[PDB]
A paper describes a structure:
GluA3, a subtype strongly associated with disease, functions as both a fast-transmitting Ca2+-permeable AMPAR at sensory synapses, and as a Ca2+-impermeable receptor at cortical synapses. Here we present cryo-electron microscopy structures of the Ca2+-permeable GluA3 homomer, which substantially diverges from other AMPARs. The GluA3 extracellular domain tiers (N-terminal domain (NTD) and ligand-binding domain (LBD)) are closely coupled throughout gating states, creating interfaces that impact signalling and contain human disease-associated mutations. Central to this architecture is a stacking interaction between two arginine residues (Arg163) in the NTD dimer interface, trapping a unique NTD dimer conformation that enables close contacts with the LBD.
AMPAR activation is initiated by agonist associating with the A/C LBD clamshells, which interface with the NTD in the resting-state GluA3. To assess this gating transition in GluA3-G, we captured the receptor in an open state (in the presence of l-glutamate and the desensitization blocker cyclothiazide ) and monitored the conformational changes using standard 3D classification procedures. Overall, we observed greater heterogeneity of both the NTD and LBD tiers compared with the apo state, with fewer classes exhibiting NTDs interfacing with the LBD (20% versus 45%). More frequent detachment of the NTD and LBD was also apparent through analysis with DynaMight. We further processed particles using a well-resolved NTD dimer (resulting from docking to the LBD), and these displayed clear features of activated AMPARs: closed LBD clamshells and a dilated gate that matches gate dimensions of other AMPAR subtypes. Critically, the NTD–LBD interface of active GluA3-G closely resembled that of the apo-state receptor (root mean squared deviation (r.m.s.d.), 0.27 Å), as did the flat NTD dimer organization with stacked Arg163 side chains and putative chloride ligand. The inter-tier coupling therefore occurs in both resting-state and active GluA3.
Author numbering:
A (entry chain C): 2 to 304, 309 to 381, 394 to 410, 423 to 496, 737 to 756
B (entry chain B): 2 to 304, 309 to 381
Write the structure that this text describes.
Amino acid sequence: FPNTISIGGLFMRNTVQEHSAFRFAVQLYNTNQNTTEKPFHLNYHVDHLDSSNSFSVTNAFCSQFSRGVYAIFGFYDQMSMNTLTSFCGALHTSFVTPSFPTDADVQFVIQMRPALKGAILSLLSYYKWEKFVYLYDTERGFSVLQAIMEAAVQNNWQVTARSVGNIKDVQEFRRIIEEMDRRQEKRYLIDCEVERINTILEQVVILGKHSRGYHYMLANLGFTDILLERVMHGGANITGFQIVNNENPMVQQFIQRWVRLDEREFPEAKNAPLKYTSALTHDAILVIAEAFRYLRRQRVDVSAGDCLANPAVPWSQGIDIERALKMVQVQGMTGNIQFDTYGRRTNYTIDVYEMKVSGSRKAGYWNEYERFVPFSNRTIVVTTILESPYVMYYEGYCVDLAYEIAKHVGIKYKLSIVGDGKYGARDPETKIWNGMVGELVYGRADIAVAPLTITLVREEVIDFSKPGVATPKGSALGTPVNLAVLK
Amino acid sequence: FPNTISIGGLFMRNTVQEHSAFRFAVQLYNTNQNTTEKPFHLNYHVDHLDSSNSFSVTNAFCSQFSRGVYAIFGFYDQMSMNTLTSFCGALHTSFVTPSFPTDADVQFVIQMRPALKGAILSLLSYYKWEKFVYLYDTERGFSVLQAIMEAAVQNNWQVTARSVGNIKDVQEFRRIIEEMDRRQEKRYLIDCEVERINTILEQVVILGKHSRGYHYMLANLGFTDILLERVMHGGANITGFQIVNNENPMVQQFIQRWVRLDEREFPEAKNAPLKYTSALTHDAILVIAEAFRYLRRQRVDVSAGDCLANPAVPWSQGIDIERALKMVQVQGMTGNIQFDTYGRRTNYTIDVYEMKVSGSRKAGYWNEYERFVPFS
C-alpha cells in the first residue's frame, strides 16, 4: 500500500469557499496525530477549468489523469457534466462530486448531494397541494421535473409548469407572476438556482404578493443563500429544505475551527455563511479517507498513460476503489452517508424548515423510510365605460346595476374604466381585441357591467347574460350573473 | 501542393441520406475528367459518432485528427456541439457543418445552414403579427428565441412563449393549445424539430384548431419533411421556409443523376425525399473543392500529432485553409454560397412558401438586403 495517496481536484469559477473547505479538510486529515486515523499522507492536485470550453476541460482532466491519481474530487455544470462523467466511466476513475446528481445511472461517480424529489413529493402530499405552479430551470437535471409531472398525472393534480431558465428580462417574471395571480394561484413551487430564486422573490416583493395566504416552496438546498427578509416581513408561508443542521456537534466544531482561519490563505473563511456545498466537500474528503483506510486494512494492492487510447485499457484496481468508495459508512456535517450501486446517497435526513414571522423554524424532517415527520374573498374587477347616463363621476345606471348584481351574488367588486375607452372590436390585421371585450378575453377583467350590445362576433369570445352583462368564457360568474339578471 | 487531399467525416445517428450524398458528391468530383476541375484526388475517412458519450466523440475526432485530414465535414447536436467546436477551434482544424449555426461567434467552423432570424422577423413584420404564440425548443440554439424576444420588446408585441422541448406527454400539448385558444390566439410560431412539429400539428388536428381562421408559421427548414395534408384539408394558413429550389437546373441535374443510383451502394437515395441536409452536404463538397483549388492556384503550401498536447500548438497552415474556405462565392443546390468572417452564410435567399388547399405555392423569397419580396 502506498505511503502517500494523491487525488485530483477540479473546481469551476464562482467556487472559492468550496476550494477552501477542500484544502482545510485535507489539512485536518493530515494533522491527525493518531496513526490509525491517518495511516497514509494525502495530497491534492487542485486545478481550475472553464466548462464553457470542452477542450480545456478535457486537457485539465487528462493532466490530472496522467499525473497519477486514485480519485478525482470535482464539480460539473450542465455543460461539463457529460465530458467528466463519460471520461471517468470510460477510464475507470472514481469521481466524487458534490454537485447535482446525474439523471442517468452511471458508474464510477459518487454524488454527495442528496436528491430532493422524494422530499418534495412528500411535502406536497403532506400540505395537500392539489393545484399549484411549478417554476423550473434545467440547471440541476430533469429528475425533479419528471417526478413532479408524473406525480401530477398520477394524482390528477393541476400543475402549471413554466421553464424560467431562458428568461433574461425581469419583466417576464413580473408578467408570469401577474398572470398566475389572476388565475388565483396561491401556491408556487420554485425549483431554480439561488440567483434565479432571488430574482423571482424580489419581483414578488415589488409586485406585493408576499402577503398572507401565499405559500412558497423553495426546492433548493440553499436556504441560507436565499434572500427572503422582505418576504418574511410580508408574512407569507415559506417552506425550504436543508441538510446542514447547526445543532450537530460536528457542524459546531467545524464552524468554530473554521472561523479562526485567516482570510488570506483561506479566502472567504469567516466572512460569509457556510454554504452547504462546503459541508458536502468536507464530507467527500471524509468519505475518500474512510474508503482508502478500508482498502489499506483489507490488504488490497492499488497502483498512468493517456486519455485517448484506441485500445482503452481500464485500471484493474479502479473497480476495487469504486466499490470501496460506494460501501462507506460515515457520519459527516450532512448526517449519515451511504451510497447505492449507482453512487447516489441513501438514508436521507433532510431537514424541512418552515419560515415564521420571527425567523426560520424547523418544521420537521424527511427520511427515505419514515417519509416526512413534522415537529408538531377577493375584489373582482368590473370593467366599465364612461358614458352617460350609465357611468358618471362613480354613479349612474350601470353602477346601480353592478351594485345590485354584486348584492345578489356574494362578491366584492371594484369598478375600473377602460383606458382606451372603446367598446371592443377585432382588428382585421392583427386580430387583436380592444376595449372591454379585449379586457375580458385577455383576462384583465372578470365582468363588464356596461352597455355592451350583444352581437354574433362577441358571443363567440365571451358569454353574455340576458339583455347585456358580459363575462369571460368559462368563468364561474356566468350562471350567478345570469340568474341575478333574471331577478 | 499534395496530389491527394484527405478529409474527415463525422456522421451522427439518423444520418444515412447525408452520408450517401457525401459519398456521391465526392465520387462526382473525382469522376470529373477535366484537368482544371480535378487537380487532385479527394479522399474521405468516415466515422460514426454516438453523440451521447463525450469519450466516443473525442476518440473519433482524435482518430480523424491523427490519421491526417485537411478538413472535417460533420454533424453535431446541442449535446456534442461544444466538444467538436472547441477541439476544431483549438487545433485550427476547419469544421464544415450543415448543422444549426452556433449561437456564439467561433472560429474554424464553416456553417452553411442559413439563419432563420431575418426571414422570420420579416414575415412577422409583413403579416402584422403583433400578437402570437411561440412554441419553441432549444435543440438548435437560443438565437431565434433571443431575436424574437428582442423584437417583441422593441416593437411592443404580445408574444406568449412556451418551451415544449421538455414535454413528453401529448396531453400537455393539448392543454397548451386549449389554453391559448381560450385567449383567442389565432397565430402560432412553431420553432421546433420536425418530429415535435408533427406531434403539435397532430394535436391541433385532433382539437380541430385548423380551420380557416388559424395561421401556423413553421419556423424550421425542411418544409417537405413535415406532414401537412391533414392540416391542409382544414384550410388553415401555413407558412414555411426552404433553401433548395426544385426548379434550379443544378438541383434538377443532381436529382436526375441521384435517383438512378444503386440502393445497396447508396442507401436512402431512391424512393425517399431529398433532405435539405443532403443538399447542404453536396454544397459542402463544392465549397471544399473550390477552397482547395483556390489554395493550389495561389501556390499556398498546405501539408499530425495528438489532440491533447500541452501547450497545444496549432499548425500554421490552418489559418490559410480557413481563410480560403471562408472566401468562396459558389452557386450550389441551395443557391448562392458566401461566408462572412465568422463562417456564416451571407447573400443567401430563403424561399417562403404559403401552403394552400390545392398545394404548396412559393409565396416569395427573403434576402438580407432586399427583404421579403412577395410574388402575388
